[PDB]
Design a protein around this ligand. Sequence first.
Ligand SMILES: [Zn+2]
Lengths: 95, 96, 35, 99, 68, 87, 83, 108, 76, 42
Amino acid sequence: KTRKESYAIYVYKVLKQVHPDTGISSKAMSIMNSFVNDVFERIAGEASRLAHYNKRSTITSREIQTAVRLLLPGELAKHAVSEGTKAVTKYTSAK
Amino acid sequence: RKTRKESYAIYVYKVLKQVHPDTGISSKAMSIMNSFVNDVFERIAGEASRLAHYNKRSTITSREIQTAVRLLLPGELAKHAVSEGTKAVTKYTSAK
Amino acid sequence: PWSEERVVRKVLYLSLKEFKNSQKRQHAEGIAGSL
Amino acid sequence: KPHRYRPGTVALREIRRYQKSTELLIRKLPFQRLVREIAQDFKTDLRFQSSAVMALQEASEAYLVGLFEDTNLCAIHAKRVTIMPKDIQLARRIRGERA
Amino acid sequence: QRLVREIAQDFKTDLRFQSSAVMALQEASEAYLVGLFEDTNLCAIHAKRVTIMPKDIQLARRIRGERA
Amino acid sequence: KRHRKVLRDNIQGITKPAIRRLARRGGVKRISGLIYEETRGVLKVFLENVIRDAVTYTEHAKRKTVTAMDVVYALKRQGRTLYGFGG
Amino acid sequence: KVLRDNIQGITKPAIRRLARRGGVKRISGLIYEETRGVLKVFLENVIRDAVTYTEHAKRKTVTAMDVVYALKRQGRTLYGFGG
Amino acid sequence: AKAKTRSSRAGLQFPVGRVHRLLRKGNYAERVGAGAPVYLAAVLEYLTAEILELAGNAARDNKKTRIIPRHLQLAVRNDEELNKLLGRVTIAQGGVLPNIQSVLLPKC
Amino acid sequence: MQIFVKTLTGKTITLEVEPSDTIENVKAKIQDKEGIPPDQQRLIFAGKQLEDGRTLSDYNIQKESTLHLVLRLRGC
Amino acid sequence: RSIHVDGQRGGVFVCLWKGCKVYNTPSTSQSWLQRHMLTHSG
DNA sequence: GTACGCGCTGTCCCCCGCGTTTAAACCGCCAAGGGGATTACTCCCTAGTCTCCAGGCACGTCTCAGATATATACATCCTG
DNA sequence: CAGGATGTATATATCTGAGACGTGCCTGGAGACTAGGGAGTAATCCCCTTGGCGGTTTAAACGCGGGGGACAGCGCGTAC
Ligand SMILES: [Zn+2]
């Protein structure tokens, strides 16, 4: 018992959207789990400070945007920011 | 002339004379000590922050700080400082 | 004002193999978007 | 009559061999013994999960490997082909480890 | 100062530089080079020489974890 | 007789051919003979550092059993994160 | 003689000076290039993030505290200039 | 009635509800905006997609059906822009990149 | 545009090349017209060793220029 | 050192002298005590 | 046996002063724009209920994954 | 300076069976649906400090040369 969370299912889904026909071993799932669990904090912690400096109290997108501009090196930043911008401005249009 | 700032300068100075009661101190060195204190305070705090969440408590206690020291200060300084803090508490307990 | 001759004498003397980058990974700049 | 290979040629095959596989390189039971040995001095009467030891190993090995590689570059810098403790002690200091 | 103002041209134009910050930039940019040269020196010595050549710098950085 | 068979000189449990294997994986060709003690000490220092904090955590959580998470946290604090063990 | 892309502003004797405080004795002829590039690289890697902070704060002038932060980022803390 | 997943309303796959829970309970700030968890989840999804895709080709080029760590290693270490992001991580069961110095080869 | 590639053996060859051609492509042309492998060649002009990734326009080379090629063996 | 310094056993540096700029002033570091003694008495 | 290690050498290429050319400093003057404080407000995110469905757990298989067995090219290291 | 013999490689066949993939079930946490009140937010104004400037002056940079010593090359013994 004592349920645990994970990201397995979502990983598998995303996998199916690129090589729709390729399996994934067990451990190589646990890895890709831990990896997300890492990057998540490595961004959220940074954004926390970044807000705390200018003495705000809320976290919004804008900083997450900046915070990304700091960690991801170069072209990955160029892409990810476009991705975010897009995949939010849609959502706000249709709640 | 408004919007007061803060520092530790007072306390640096006070504890200074308790050791070299004849010595002065420039401004730059004052600022440096200030920054240094700020650094260390944060390090130790942030450490204990995780230490709780791991065991999923919700309040920082002394016991937290105790170990959190043992993970930053190398060797000797740790053994000294833990003694120090242990003492400083005991008194405060009885001496409200 | 450029010591090309001196650097060429150095090329003749040192004369050792050198290592550098090989491939162009522009695909990480490309298909990544189409990913 | 009996065939014997050129000196040092076996290695050139050893490398291309090992740089491919992925499994461990140290037999467990002695390693586990060693760990349990060191552990006593901090708080004797301990008890371990299995995977914990596996982890400890995994890291140790990855460390040593990465260390050797840079040791090698050092050794080349001085136009040798072997290695010597004087080499390790260089990298182990430039890194800032034994700084 | 003329240097940094030049490099700052790209990431944006028409910036202003609070004076003191330039001092910090300078200062930190120097304690870097010092410690660098130090390690280059140890490197070169290890090869039984007395003078330092660019390959020393390159090796030093690589081991340090900057170039690769 | 229950426990505490304190063993000594297990560092010699690291055979020379073992270390040969590692070095090979590293990519070295010719090897001196003194190294077989250099590494025997280097590795020990490395271990000690980790195992200390490893213990420290459990101790704080006051059990008698060193889980894997513990080791993970330790290896992280020193800037050597490790994937694949339930981060 | 005024045409000077500021990178040239790093005079060779200057480099020699730092080299001394390090503790080097002799010096090849080429290093006076390696340094000019290395310093450059190191510089952008910091001025970029400094800029970034200023931007996100909507400001228009590079406060020291920014440069300090950016320096703590790379793993190079710096005492004294405030913080 | 007839509720809809926020992820749908975004058109993604990551549990935006789950994320937005995590931020509140992580002491990351005092109060969380609305748009953030969206933006965050989008970034995460993009990243993991990129890496998985690369690994897929990696393993196929070895002519196998599934994906195992050794692939992931051989996947990351070959793309620098990634490789920097993972300067200090260690993938168990990872091996190394095949590599040999140029000098130690025979004369020809 | 035409260029002159003077070699250490007293031979100075002409190539067909554009300012947008890279030094890797120029070395490929050296291979195709002389059999000299591109991994063995190092071209020199304007006091610098030519970089394969850059083009002729990047070095600001004019017509009728006389470039220098040294045979540098890597490997073996 | 045998008459005033060693007889000054304590965590304080209250040790006395005629003509010192600091006089009857405590100090929590006895090392600095003996240091000041070596400075003054010569 | 080969890789090392020691010694001999024949350089040419940095150090070291010397004139001389200069750009840095400092000193002063000046303008403004942008940063920093102050005000009125609003609308957005927190809180609280009610609910119902996505997600975790336990099974059960079949596979195709993989394993294993078998068999041929090829790259060394010798000979004339 | 080229062939022959070689142990290595490499492939191809068999099973064989643990364990990725579904598959149901059940439920607690995510979502719809409610007010509220303060964090941000425009809007404001008023320094000020940062560029920007124009003379000295002067030490620091610069170019020259010359020479001497560090080095890269080469050769030879050997012991690990
Ligand atoms: Zn006195």
